[PDB]
Design a binder for this molecule. Structure first.
Ligand SMILES: Cn1nc(-c2cc(Br)c3c(c2)OCO3)cc1N
Ligand SMILES: Cn1nc(-c2cc(Br)c3c(c2)OCO3)cc1N
Ligand SMILES: [Cl-]
Ligand SMILES: [Cl-]
Ligand SMILES: [Mg+2]
Lengths: 134, 138
């Protein structure tokens, strides 16, 4: 289902990474965030929803999802709350020494994951969404 | 062409916004950045290239593009470096500015609006970029 994403957190080097996976394709958007708070989570969700058609996000339903700010951002953006991640940590592992900062390593890992190839996750998400539009 | 993006800087409230436009569709990625430096520019380009198939970026060729860090990021990602948008984006930011404490939030609401706006049975920039890239793959 083309509008469905899963949002999870993962922790490395005392920092928090949010990883959104487009369920049908395995395409990922991920960011290091300063704290696992409602404000940062809402911001992440807003960014994601401005970039891809996000209809539903499956989350862990934890503390950062209970507050006014995340609720307001999902409402505004029209989002409902209703395998790649150990791989992501593995890729960050392989590129870590090339980056001074974890955030750079995370983005190199997103690039690798989304481009790795019959199709890449990047190719899959565009094919899925294009097909839906039709 | 499907892999061609234009990257420009916009200034508001003493802050720097980078705006990348997918030339063929008008779809945008934008973010407020700490400073208009090679390191932040390279980071932005890396992020962009990990999310869409970026082959060529047309930039203003200024100071933040001369250094080793941007050059290395473009090389790694396989990218070549070869007015109304940022005006309309500025206009939407103005429209939503009072709803957010932070400029960065207003910028992302503006990206959302710009990319989803259906200008008629027309298409949005979001629909257009996916249609273009899917067509190129097929
Ligand atoms: C391996 N490969 N991957 C792509 C590709 C990569 C990313 Br990221 C994308 C995309 C297509 O559409 C949305 O994001 C194109 C080719 N040839
Ligand atoms: C108006 N409208 N816009 C979309 C839509 C919006 C965004 Br953002 C996208 C996208 C499609 O693919 C990549 O990013 C779907 C519909 N119905
Ligand atoms: Cl979370
Ligand atoms: Cl610039
Ligand atoms: Mg410029």
């Amino acid at each position: 289902s083309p509008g469905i994403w899963q949002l999870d957190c993962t922790h490395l080097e005392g920092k928090v990474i949010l990883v959104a996976v487009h369920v049908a394709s395995g395409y990922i958007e991920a960011e290091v965030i300063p704290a696992e708070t409602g404000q940062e989570t809402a911001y992440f969700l807003l960014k994601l929803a401005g970039r891809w058609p996000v209809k539903t996000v499956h989350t862990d339903n934890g503390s950062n999802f209970t507050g006014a700010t995340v609720r307001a951002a999902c409402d505004w953006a029209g989002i409902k709350q209703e395998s790649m991640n150990k791989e992501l940590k593995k890729i960050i592992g392989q590129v870590r020494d090339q980056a001074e900062h974890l955030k750079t390593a995370v983005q190199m890992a997103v690039f690798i994951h989304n481009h790795k190839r019959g199709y890449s996750a990047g190719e899959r998400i565009v094919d899925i969404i294009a097909t839906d539009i039709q």
